[PDB]
Amino acid sequence: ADEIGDAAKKLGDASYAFAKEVDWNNGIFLQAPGKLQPLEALKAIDKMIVMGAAADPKLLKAAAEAHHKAIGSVSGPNGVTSRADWDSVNAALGRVIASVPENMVMDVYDSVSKITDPKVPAYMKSLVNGADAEKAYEGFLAFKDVVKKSQ
Amino acid sequence: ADEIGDAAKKLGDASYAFAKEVDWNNGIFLQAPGKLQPLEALKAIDKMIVMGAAADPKLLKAAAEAHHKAIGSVSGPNGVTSRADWDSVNAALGRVIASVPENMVMDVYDSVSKITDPKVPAYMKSLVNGADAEKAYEGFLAFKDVVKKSQ
Ligand SMILES: CCCCCCCCCCCCCCCCCC(=O)OC[C@H](CO[C@@H]1O[C@H](CO[C@H]2O[C@H](CO)[C@H](O)[C@H](O)[C@H]2O)[C@H](O)[C@H](O)[C@H]1O)OC(=O)CCCCCCCCCCCCCCCCC
Ligand SMILES: CCCCCCCCCCCCCCCCCC(=O)OC[C@H](CO[C@@H]1O[C@H](CO[C@H]2O[C@H](CO)[C@H](O)[C@H](O)[C@H]2O)[C@H](O)[C@H](O)[C@H]1O)OC(=O)CCCCCCCCCCCCCCCCC
Ligand code: BCL
Ligand code: BCL
Ligand SMILES: CC(=O)O[C@H]1CC(C)(C)C(=C=C/C(C)=C/C=C/C=C/C=C(C)/C=C2C=C(/C=C/[C@@]34O[C@]3(C)C[C@@H](O)CC4(C)C)C(=O)O/2)[C@](C)(O)C1
Ligand SMILES: CC(=O)O[C@H]1CC(C)(C)C(=C=C/C(C)=C/C=C/C=C/C=C(C)/C=C2C=C(/C=C/[C@@]34O[C@]3(C)C[C@@H](O)CC4(C)C)C(=O)O/2)[C@](C)(O)C1
Ligand SMILES: CC(=O)O[C@H]1CC(C)(C)C(=C=C/C(C)=C/C=C/C=C/C=C(C)/C=C2C=C(/C=C/[C@@]34O[C@]3(C)C[C@@H](O)CC4(C)C)C(=O)O/2)[C@](C)(O)C1
Ligand SMILES: CC(=O)O[C@H]1CC(C)(C)C(=C=C/C(C)=C/C=C/C=C/C=C(C)/C=C2C=C(/C=C/[C@@]34O[C@]3(C)C[C@@H](O)CC4(C)C)C(=O)O/2)[C@](C)(O)C1
Ligand SMILES: CC(=O)O[C@H]1CC(C)(C)C(=C=C/C(C)=C/C=C/C=C/C=C(C)/C=C2C=C(/C=C/[C@@]34O[C@]3(C)C[C@@H](O)CC4(C)C)C(=O)O/2)[C@](C)(O)C1
Ligand SMILES: CC(=O)O[C@H]1CC(C)(C)C(=C=C/C(C)=C/C=C/C=C/C=C(C)/C=C2C=C(/C=C/[C@@]34O[C@]3(C)C[C@@H](O)CC4(C)C)C(=O)O/2)[C@](C)(O)C1
Ligand SMILES: CC(=O)O[C@H]1CC(C)(C)C(=C=C/C(C)=C/C=C/C=C/C=C(C)/C=C2C=C(/C=C/[C@@]34O[C@]3(C)C[C@@H](O)CC4(C)C)C(=O)O/2)[C@](C)(O)C1
Ligand SMILES: CC(=O)O[C@H]1CC(C)(C)C(=C=C/C(C)=C/C=C/C=C/C=C(C)/C=C2C=C(/C=C/[C@@]34O[C@]3(C)C[C@@H](O)CC4(C)C)C(=O)O/2)[C@](C)(O)C1
Ligand SMILES: [Cl-]
Ligand SMILES: [Cl-]
Ligand SMILES: [Cl-]
Ligand SMILES: [Cl-]
Ligand SMILES: [K+]
Ligand SMILES: [K+]
Ligand code: NA
Ligand code: NA
Numbered sequence: 001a002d003e004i005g006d007a008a009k010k011l012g013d014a015s016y017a018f019a020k021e022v023d024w025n026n027g028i029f030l031q032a033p034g035k036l037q038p039l040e041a042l043k044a045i046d047k048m049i050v051m052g053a054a055a056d057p058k059l060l061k062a063a064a065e066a067h068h069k070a071i072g073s074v075s076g077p078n079g080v081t082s083r084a085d086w087d088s089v090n091a092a093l094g095r096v097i098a099s100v101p102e103n104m105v106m107d108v109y110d111s112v113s114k115i116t117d118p119k120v121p122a123y124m125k126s127l128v129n130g131a132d133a134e135k136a137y138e139g140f141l142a143f144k145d146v147v148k149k150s151q
Numbered sequence: 152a153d154e155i156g157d158a159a160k161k162l163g164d165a166s167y168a169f170a171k172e173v174d175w176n177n178g179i180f181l182q183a184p185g186k187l188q189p190l191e192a193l194k195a196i197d198k199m200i201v202m203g204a205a206a207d208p209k210l211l212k213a214a215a216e217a218h219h220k221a222i223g224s225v226s227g228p229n230g231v232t233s234r235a236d237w238d239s240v241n242a243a244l245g246r247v248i249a250s251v252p253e254n255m256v257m258d259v260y261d262s263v264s265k266i267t268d269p270k271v272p273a274y275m276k277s278l279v280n281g282a283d284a285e286k287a288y289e290g291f292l293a294f295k296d297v298v299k300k301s302q
Binding site for chain 1 (some may be wrong): 162174175176178181182183187189190196197201202203209211212215216218219222225230274
């Protein structure tokens with residue numbers, strides 16, 4: 001047990017209503033988030049490869065194992081994993097994020113934001129309950145504070 | 152140095168003409184290979200997650216580092232990496248493949264083949280020189296024989 005684990009459980013309370021509302025079987029997630037810009041997208045992938053090469057190998061392994069288990073408990077019409085496995089996933093990703101320097105995480109965020117059309121967040125939000133999306137994001141802000149303290 | 156490394160250099164001789172011919176900046180690679188079938192595709196991704204969780208963490212790390220270096224040497228109008236970095240990539244992936252049981256690798260191959268439309272290989276081949284694609288594949292057959300012997 002650790003503090004990211006505890007923080008993940010508060011994140012779930014804040015965000016699992018939102019996770020149940022997203023239709024995870026929508027084909028839209030395979031689409032570029034706006035115009036496909038292969039050269040800019042390669043830049044964003046390079047930043048993620050750098051981050052992955054720097055991330056703790058055991059925490060990467062655990063994150064994969066948590067997603068395999070989360071695939072096993074998908075149910076309902078939107079393909080949502082169980083609440084326990086949602087929390088498991090979020091804690092294991094928080095530990096990966098904490099295992100690399102802050103600059104590597106911001107470089108993925110900035111490099112992806114460059115290729116994301118400004119309409120994409122509001123479009124996604126419009127498909128779920130907006131209050132539950134707000135509550136999920138406020139959850140995320142509290143969670144990343146604990147992550148940063150282990151980082 | 153190892154035998155997969157040596158085998159990668161013979162693979163490059165056989166396959167780098169083909170790699171120069173693929174237009175790696177084509178947007179088509181983001182598309183599903185045929186009809187998007189989210190539930191079947193999740194099955195194929197689950198098999199890759201299982202394989203990744205079982206793969207040697209150091210060899211996964213080295214494979215990411217080799218792709219970061221290969222992104223650095225992209226040139227020309229098709230986005231092809233250098234010949235040296237092509238070989239580097241192929242040897243590092245061969246080592247990952249050798250670090251897990253044969254069944255995990257076949258389960259990814261079978262689970263992806265299930266979602267790949269039968270026209271997709273011939274369509275891809277039609278965009279390059281067909282003899283060089285054949286030579287690249289015969290390379291791959293010789294390479295996977297060395298991989299299997301380290302596996
Ligand atoms: C096949 C090859 C591989 C293909 C895939 C690889 C590439 C993947 C690219 C596609 C994924 C991108 C689309 C994701 C959209 C979700 C992000 C979002 O909705 O974000 C919404 C926000 C909204 O903006 C925020 O809005 C906030 C509003 O808060 C206010 O209001 C709030 C509640 O409303 C709270 O009350 C809060 O306290 C109050 O401050 C603040 O103003 C913030 O400053 C502002 O940042 O937009 C932002 O962050 C701006 C940037 C948006 C995009 C940034 C990306 C975010 C995630 C990047 C990391 C990885 C993603 C890919 C990796 C794949 C995984 C392995
Ligand atoms: C954003 C979320 C993430 C998105 C992406 C995740 C999912 C990705 C799915 C999209 C990628 C799939 C499309 C790839 C097509 C390339 C495969 C191919 O052209 O293959 C062509 C072959 C042609 O068939 C072969 O044809 C051969 C012909 O050989 C003959 O002829 C030859 C030369 O012509 C030689 O002479 C030889 O000696 C002689 O035997 C033999 O008959 C073989 O038995 C037969 O298998 O089709 C086959 O294998 C049949 C199966 C074809 C598809 C199988 C997949 C292959 C690769 C799977 C592994 C990973 C891919 C995804 C992972 C992502 C990476 C991290
Ligand atoms: C071995 C490594 C792991 C893995 C490592 C990572 C890492 C590392 C990250 C992702 C993130 C994401 N992964 Mg993952 N991921 C894996 C397996 C999967 C599988 C699968 C089939 O198993 C799927 C479908 C996905 C899907 C996703 C997306 C939901 C998301 C990227 C788009 C995004 O930002 O949407 C928006 C994201 C969500 C809807 C997820 C929940 C986010 C928070 C907790 C709550 C909602 C807040 C707010 C409303 C919306 C997001 C705004 C912010 C700017 C964060 N991953 C593998 C097994 N994944 C990224 C992410 O979520 O970025 C924010 C991320 O940082
Ligand atoms: C950390 C892990 C690694 C990684 C791990 C893997 C693993 C593991 C595999 C892939 C494979 C692939 N990866 Mg990779 N990959 C990474 C980074 C990338 C990046 C990036 C921007 O850095 C890109 C663009 C890609 C692109 C690709 C595709 C070319 C390919 C999956 C589709 C396919 O089978 O096409 C067909 C493939 C090619 C055109 C590549 C060369 C194949 C051989 C050597 C020569 C051509 C033979 C023949 C003509 C065509 C293929 C037929 C066969 C059935 C093999 N990877 C990261 C950093 N990648 C898979 C693959 O190639 O399956 C065959 C695979 O097994
Ligand atoms: C081989 C292998 O290992 O694969 C694994 C590798 C990983 C990395 C581990 C992995 C993973 C995680 C991944 C890739 C997550 C990807 C997330 C992508 C989210 C995409 C989104 C949000 C896309 C869009 C596109 C939109 C377009 C919207 C618009 O066009 C619309 C409609 C109408 C227009 O008029 C206006 C518009 C509004 C502009 C939108 O609104 O959103 C996974 C899945 O495990 C597979
Ligand atoms: C060895 C091996 O296998 O490697 C493989 C390993 C993987 C894992 C499979 C792999 C991969 C994927 C990777 C690394 C994905 C990385 C994802 C990073 C996500 C980062 C996020 C969300 C960052 C942020 C930053 C934010 C900042 C928000 C704020 O600052 C803002 C705007 C304004 C402020 O006022 C307040 C604020 C709120 C502070 C935010 O909101 O979000 C890869 C590439 O395949 C390699
Ligand atoms: C088709 C289908 O059915 O797919 C099914 C597939 C599954 C797997 C079963 C499934 C599922 C679950 C999924 C996808 C869950 C996704 C979770 C994503 C979690 C992402 C996390 C936590 C990311 C971050 C990024 C962080 C960044 C933090 C910082 O940068 C920030 C901000 C500010 C800096 O100053 C300091 C900092 C600390 C650096 C962080 O702290 O955290 C589902 C729903 O069932 C769908
Ligand atoms: C070859 C093949 O087929 O592979 C298949 C493999 C799979 C794995 C089966 C597959 C898949 C599934 C995938 C990747 C799923 C990824 C899902 C990502 C979902 C992202 C969502 C919901 C994003 C948002 C963003 C939002 C933003 C809301 C806000 O910012 C807004 C507006 C303003 C403020 O209020 C703050 C805010 C509240 C922050 C929101 O509210 O939500 C797929 C696609 O089938 C392809
Ligand atoms: C977040 C993160 O970590 O992301 C990283 C995660 C990874 C896993 C490390 C990673 C990687 C590797 C990946 C995903 C490789 C994906 C390869 C996909 C190849 C896709 C192909 C071939 C798609 C198609 C679609 C076709 C459609 C063809 C047709 O429709 C056409 C035209 C005409 C129709 O009439 C008939 C038809 C012929 C049927 C086709 O012929 O081919 C990467 C890139 O590093 C990003
Ligand atoms: C901890 C962590 O970060 O995990 C992350 C790590 C990654 C790496 C980023 C990640 C990932 C991606 C993974 C595992 C991708 C796996 C790719 C596997 C590819 C397999 C291939 C090509 C297999 C084959 C089998 C073949 C068989 C061909 C033949 O039998 C046939 C037909 C007929 C015979 O007569 C002759 C024959 C020729 C013998 C072939 O031709 O090809 C993931 C999921 O994101 C998790
Ligand atoms: C947008 C853009 O510019 O992107 C740029 C991005 C880059 C990275 C810079 C770039 C590049 C390089 C790239 C993608 C290279 C891809 C290489 C893929 C290599 C895949 C390999 C070796 C896969 C396998 C699978 C194997 C399976 C073997 C077996 O199953 C088989 C068969 C039979 C079983 O009985 C025994 C077995 C042993 C289990 C194996 O042996 O090997 C490029 C070209 O510049 C494009
Ligand atoms: C959000 C966003 O934008 O992300 C972006 C991120 C990136 C990384 C920038 C990006 C990218 C690039 C990607 C994934 C590239 C993947 C390339 C895969 C290429 C696959 C090819 C060539 C496959 C084939 C298969 C062939 C088969 C030939 C044969 O079987 C045939 C017929 C018959 C026999 O003769 C045997 C044979 C000879 C075996 C062939 O000949 O070739 C993209 C797409 O821009 C999206
Ligand atoms: Cl506890
Ligand atoms: Cl571009
Ligand atoms: Cl040598
Ligand atoms: Cl389906
Ligand atoms: K479970
Ligand atoms: K180089
Ligand atoms: Na460790
Ligand atoms: Na090792």
